Amino acid sequence: TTQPLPYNELSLFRTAKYLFGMCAESAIPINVGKGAILYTLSRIANRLEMVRTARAVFEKLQGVILPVSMMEQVDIETLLVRSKPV
């Protein structure tokens, strides 16, 4: 999320799913943010064409706070993801 570094796609997708699953169970630890993990899951699902998952996590991502240089891009991404077959 915060660095222009090489990454795996499927591994990051499964990591995002695991973090989404185990972040709502109890109190989230310090410096683990829901906005970053939701943005990562949304972007990877959009790239990997998990379009139904992408729009689900996007409608969830609508209800969190993003950095000041991210709202416009996430608006464009979530408006574009509303196309394509579900």
């Binding site: 609508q62 706070i65 416009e72 608006d75 464009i76 408006l79 574009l80 509303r82 196309s83």
Partner: protein, 591 residues
């Protein structure tokens, strides 16, 4: 170039003789004087209200700082001031005989009164004290101009070659005689420079000597003797200088370090330039030689002839005085035979924008692209005609008249023409992006690919199945937005499939989408402004929205601020995406 004759001014208006004109820098008013010895002030309607009799006209000018008209006489030592606004007459005695010129400073409330004996003085109105300066010149003065800047220097030229530099006390440090009488000299200032650094060039008929008044470095410039003498001297662009030649050749000079390099020269005209003027506010150079008119524009590639020639009738007289207005819209030429011809140089108020780029008109056939990041012109677009309306997108500029539109593919620096397309109905409004274009006609919008590929996609018409009239549209890179009085709909350009649709119950008159096609500040029938976020589909009315102000512009630098204006004032609205009270759209208030 379009030559349209509006009206003809015969010699019966001003009489046979010199024509004196005075252009108001701000108001669209001009004062005219001739051999009839009367003052004619022309309004927008051309109706004569009154004639002010004043004979033996020498010069005229209008003052901008206080809007005060000054009238002087050559046969009397007293100056009479008449105020048209208050109908009051006053007399102030300058105690000087045979006045020849009068000039006012547009930057400071300081004026000087001169005489034909070469004396210039400074007048202190508060203390009524005059400091006399004598023996400065021994012959008749030629002209005297002021520098429109913070540099409080007065320059007066005459037929005795001399250069005088004086301190605040008026003491002349030294006087260096010159081999011959100089012809002319001009001063150019840098507006963007905070200190306004300027350099003066002195011409010696057959020699050009440049002396740096700061570093005290002296260099001798050697030029070919076959070039000839310099006819006219005028200021250029960004400190450049343009010098004529007896052969009529115009040369572009480039400074490479301490050397001057002649990249190229072309002999455009055969005769000398009768009169040359430079427009500081327009940057257009025009030359008149005999019955020929030429236009010079500084380009990167050089000078190329347009191939068009026009012949002027000799019955209108030989021009002798030429002054271009600062705005460049009004051109008045006076002839010594009493014939005045007025040429209308139209510059369209049609403009467009995209991101940090603003598209306006620099000439009749060139569109200037200005970048707000650097505040300088970066590219230019060639135009085939004078478009009625222009629109901008990403790497695409459209310019149209009535029901036809021409497309250019600008890039940042060159422009490429693509196609001219006619449409069955007049195009009321127009939006465009890099690949497609939306044209408003038939009460609807045609969206079509501009590229004329043999396998192009079929153009689409919106709205479909019929909802109501369209009020406004907007276009972006991947989104097409169309607004009716009932629904605002956004479609993804990669599929033309519906993604966002907001229903407005209170109607809609004028919609104003953000550049990213995600937020619409739309005005309903109840004179209210709603800031609808098209993503989450929430309608929030703008607090403090004055219904008098109708137009909305979305800021291109900030995505949370826009401006609502009318013909006179404006107010700034801020869009907060999240707070305790949810997303808000509030007018900025006063302390």
């Amino acid at each position: 170039m379009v030559l349209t004759q509006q009206f003809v001014i015969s010699n019966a208006d001003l009489g046979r003789g010199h024509v004196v004109e005075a252009l108001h820098p701000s108001s669209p008013l001009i004062a005219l004087a001739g051999s009839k010895g009367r003052v004619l002030i022309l309004n927008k309607t051309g109706k004569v209200e009154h004639q002010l009799p004043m004979q033996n006209v020498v010069a005229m000018e209008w003052e901008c700082s206080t809007d005060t008209l000054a009238i002087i006489t050559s046969s009397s030592s007293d100056v009479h001031l008449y105020t048209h606004r208050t109908r009051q007459t006053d007399t102030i005695d300058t105690k000087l005989k045979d006045l020849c010129f009068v000039c006012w400073s547009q930057s400071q409330p300081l004026f000087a009164i001169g005489s034909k004996s070469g004396q210039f003085v400074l007048y202190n109105r508060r203390t009524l004290r005059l400091v006399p300066v004598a023996d400065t010149h021994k012959q008749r003065l030629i002209s005297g101009m002021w520098v429109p800047a913070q540099d409080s220097r007065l320059l007066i030229i005459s037929e005795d070659p001399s250069l005088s530099i004086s301190d605040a006390e008026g003491k002349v440090l030294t006087t260096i005689p010159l081999p011959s009488v100089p012809k002319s000299v001009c001063v150019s200032g840098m507006a963007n420079s905070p200190k306004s650094s300027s350099f003066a060039a002195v011409n010696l008929d057959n020699t050009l000597l440049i002396v740096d008044l700061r570093s005290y470095a002296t260099a001798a410039g050697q030029f070919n003797s076959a070039l000839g003498q310099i006819t006219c001297l005028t200021a250029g662009i960004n400190g450049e200088f343009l010098a004529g030649f007896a052969s009529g050749t115009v040369a572009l000079l480039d400074l490479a370090g301490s050397e001057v390099r002649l990249r190229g020269s072309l002999r455009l005209l055969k005769n000398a330039v009768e009169m040359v003027n430079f427009g500081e506010g327009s940057g257009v150079v025009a030359a008149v030689a005999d019955n020929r008119v030429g236009l010079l524009r500084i380009t990167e590639d050089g000078i190329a002839p347009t191939g068009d020639e026009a012949s002027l009738e000799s019955e209108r007289g030989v021009p002798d005085l030429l002054a271009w207005s600062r705005d460049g819209q009004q051109l008045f030429v006076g002839t010594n035979q009493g014939n005045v011809t007025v040429f209308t140089l139209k510059v369209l108020n049609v403009s467009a924008s995209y991101g940090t780029l603003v598209f306006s008109f620099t000439s009749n056939r060139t569109i200037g692209v200005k970048n707000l990041q650097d505040n300088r012109v970066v590219c230019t677009v060639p135009v085939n005609s004078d478009p009625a309306f222009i629109s901008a997108g990403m790497a695409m500029l459209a310019a149209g008249v009535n029901n036809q539109v021409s497309y250019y593919e600008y890039f940042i620096a060159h422009s490429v023409f693509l196609r001219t397309v006619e449409y069955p109905s007049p195009v009321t409004d127009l939006k465009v992006n890099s690949n497609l274009a939306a044209v408003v006609y038939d009460g609807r919008v045609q969206l079509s690919p501009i590229r004329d590929t043999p396998e192009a996609a079929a153009p689409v018409y919106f709205p479909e199945s019929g909802d109501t009239r369209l009020v406004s549209i907007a276009l972006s890179e991947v989104f097409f937005l169309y607004a009716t009085t009932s629904r605002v709909s956004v479609y993804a350009l990669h599929n033309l499939q519906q993604v966002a649709t907001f229903t407005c119950n209170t109607g809609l008159k004028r919609a104003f989408a953000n550049p990213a096609c995600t937020r619409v500040a739309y005005v309903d029938d109840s004179s209210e402004l709603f800031n609808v976020n098209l993503v989450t589909e929430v309608a929030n009315k703008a607090e403090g929205y004055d219904p008098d102000q109708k137009m909305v512009l979305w800021d291109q630098a900030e995505a949370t601020v826009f401006i609502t204006y009318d013909s006179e004032k404006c107010a700034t609205f801020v869009n907060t995406p999240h707070s305790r009270h949810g997303a808000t759209c509030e007018s900025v208030l006063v302390k």
